[PDB]
Amino acid sequence: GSMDAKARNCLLQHREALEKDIKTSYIMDHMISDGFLTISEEEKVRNEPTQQQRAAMLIKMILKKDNDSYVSFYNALLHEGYKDLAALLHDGIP
Ligand SMILES: [Zn+2]
Ligand SMILES: [Zn+2]
Ligand SMILES: [Zn+2]
Ligand SMILES: [Zn+2]
Ligand SMILES: [Zn+2]
Ligand SMILES: [Zn+2]
Known about the structure:
Structural class: mainly alpha
Strand content: under 5%
Distance between the termini: 14 Å
Shape: globular
Number of helices: 7
Number of domains: 1
CATH superfamily: Death Domain, Fas
Bound molecules: zinc ion
CATH class: Mainly Alpha
């Protein structure tokens, strides 16, 4: 947990909404392509049986990463068709 309290708390207040609407495949590929998510972390997520479960795992790991990885996630949401979810996280981005 290297991310600032402000960012973490914002993500927590919207945890439920994110895990419900996102598809991890596209987001993770964008993050890896961007260089802020490892293939080892991606494999662990893909290994989950359901969409919500994969999303929950992705969120769980994001919470353990730093500020630049959180920004990558934020940027991945914006480019992968999740503007509404990103707008919720905007005020908390470092
Ligand atoms: Zn916020
Ligand atoms: Zn909020
Ligand atoms: Zn991949
Ligand atoms: Zn980093
Ligand atoms: Zn990007
Ligand atoms: Zn961009």
